[PDB]
């Protein structure tokens, strides 16, 4: 409906590797779409990448990405 997601799982998360959020819904002439979240942890496209993503004290190119 208007928010009967289901979402997939850690036996489910193909289109998306690891954590991720995977979605899939009900709904459409072409339900059960597969997504893939990338949650605070993962980059690139499918979630294939952990990102670097570590901010540290004092420095100069360590933190997030330039700025």
Same mark, same amino acid.
């Given at each position: 409906?208007? $928010? ?24 459409? $002439?072409?339900? $059960? ?35």
């Amino acid at each position: 409906g208007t $928010s009967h997601l289901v979402k997939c799982a850690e036996k489910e998360k193909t289109f998306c590797v690891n954590g991720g959020e995977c979605f899939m819904v009900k709904d459409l $002439s072409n339900p $059960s779409r597969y997504l893939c979240k990338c949650q605070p942890g993962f980059t690139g496209a499918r979630c294939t990448e952990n990102v670097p993503m570590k901010v540290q004290n004092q420095e100069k190119a360590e933190e997030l990405y330039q700025k």
